[PDB]
Amino acid sequence: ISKEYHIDEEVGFALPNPQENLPDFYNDWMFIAKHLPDLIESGQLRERVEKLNMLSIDHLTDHKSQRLARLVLGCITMAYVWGKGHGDVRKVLPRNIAVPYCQLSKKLELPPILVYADCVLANWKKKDPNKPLTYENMDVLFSFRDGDCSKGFFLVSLLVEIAAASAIKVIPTVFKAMQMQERDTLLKALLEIASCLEKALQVFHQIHDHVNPKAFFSVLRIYLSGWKGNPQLSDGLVYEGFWEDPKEFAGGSAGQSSVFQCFDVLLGIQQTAGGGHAAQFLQDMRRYMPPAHRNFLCSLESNPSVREFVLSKGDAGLREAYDACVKALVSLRSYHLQIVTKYILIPASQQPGGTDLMNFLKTVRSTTEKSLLKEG
Numbered sequence: 001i002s003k004e005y006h007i008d009e010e011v012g013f014a015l016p017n018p019q020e021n022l023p024d025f026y027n028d029w030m031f032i033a034k035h036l037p038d039l040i041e042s043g044q045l046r047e048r049v050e051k052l053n054m055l056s057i058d059h060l061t062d063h064k065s066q067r068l069a070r071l072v073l074g075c076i077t078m079a080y081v082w083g084k085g086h087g088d089v090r091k092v093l094p095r096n097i098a099v100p101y102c103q104l105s106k107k108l109e110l111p112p113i114l115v116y117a118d119c120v121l122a123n124w125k126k127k128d129p130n131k132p133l134t135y136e137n138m139d140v141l142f143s144f145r146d147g148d149c150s151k152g153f154f155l156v157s158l159l160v161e162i163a164a165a166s167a168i169k170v171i172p173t174v175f176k177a178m179q180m181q182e183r184d185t186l187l188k189a190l191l192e193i194a195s196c197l198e199k200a201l202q203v204f205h206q207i208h209d210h211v212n213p214k215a216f217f218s219v220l221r222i223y224l225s226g227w228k229g230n231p232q233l234s235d236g237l238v239y240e241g242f243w244e245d246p247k248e249f250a251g252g253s254a255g256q257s258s259v260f261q262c263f264d265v266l267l268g269i270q271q272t273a274g275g276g277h278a279a280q281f282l283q284d285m286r287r288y289m290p291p292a293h294r295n296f297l298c299s300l301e302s303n304p305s306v307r308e309f310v311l312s313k314g315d316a317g318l319r320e321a322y323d324a325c326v327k328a329l330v331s332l333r334s335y336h337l338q339i340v341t342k343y344i345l346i347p348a349s350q351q352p353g354g355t356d357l358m359n360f361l362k363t364v365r366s367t368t369e370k371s372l373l374k375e376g
């Protein structure tokens, strides 16, 4: 895969070995970001942010330092807007934080809100570099509140993301085999992809050990919420000193993951076609991905269809290998639906949004299942 797309051999779409510390110039940002749970509880978070001076972004030279600053400012912004998380909000982001956040966001080509690429793909480290990428040798860099299960939620998402890297690297073999008319190589590649997608499902199972239903629904879901079609911020958020009018941006989502879409594109599963709501949403979330990763998706669309090729051959072995990949995606959507039931639907019904996500996932699963050449 070409280096311009920023896809790593080991970790795929995740940022390899992210930066932990900023330069000493930005100590004031780091203190607030490192102690969000404490400052929110004492009721001093909004005070500390308002007392900040406006720091220039020019000392953030390299890409990794810039991605770290985005995560820092992203988490602070979520804490400032939502606060304790029981209705008391802020609709204006002070200039001292809003200006450098938007400047940095424009530079990287991402919107000025916390996205999946911040809080999963760049929000990680390993404890011992000599030891491999396991949960016990890994940690997140930032959290919102004590007992929010942010470590479990983000790290398990990252581990699934890392598992998918074994499949992503096979993609060039698939397209090369098609243009070179190499049937046996194509079959082998498709079987290898299917196997890696099956292993990714098994990695997903870890979520039950590290995430609690109450904690996710009542705490973490609040802080990941955005300001697009939200009654609490009907007009959006005012970024002081940068834009005059308030702007709307969508909150964090699994739809922002590139792995969520790239295998549907590869296999010709028409997810973003027909102008339905699910199709529109998947296209919209491409602008919430890093530019190199959105470029990768549309470049996949530029290549000839893997589905049409496999259909023309009249070869049962090839059809089987194709369906194995499709069946693995059906299994992944089905498991995601189970996770939505446990962590959102049941907690919501017990106390005196979740429905929409279920329906979206049912449409995505339905489209995937009907792309099967033979019934499973």
Ligand SMILES: O=C(NCc1ccc2c(c1)CCCN2C(=O)c1cccc(Cl)c1)c1ccc(Cl)cc1
Pocket: 115, 116, 119, 120, 153, 157, 160, 161, 164, 197, 200, 224, 252, 253, 254, 257, 259, 260, 261, 263, 329, 332, 333, 336
């Ligand atoms: O929903 C979240 N996490 C659970 C979750 C839910 C779903 C999937 C993933 C994480 C990670 C990879 C994509 N993903 C798949 O299920 C999938 C689809 C196709 C292929 C493969 Cl290998 C995985 C989540 C939501 C908001 C934020 Cl701010 C961060 C994470």
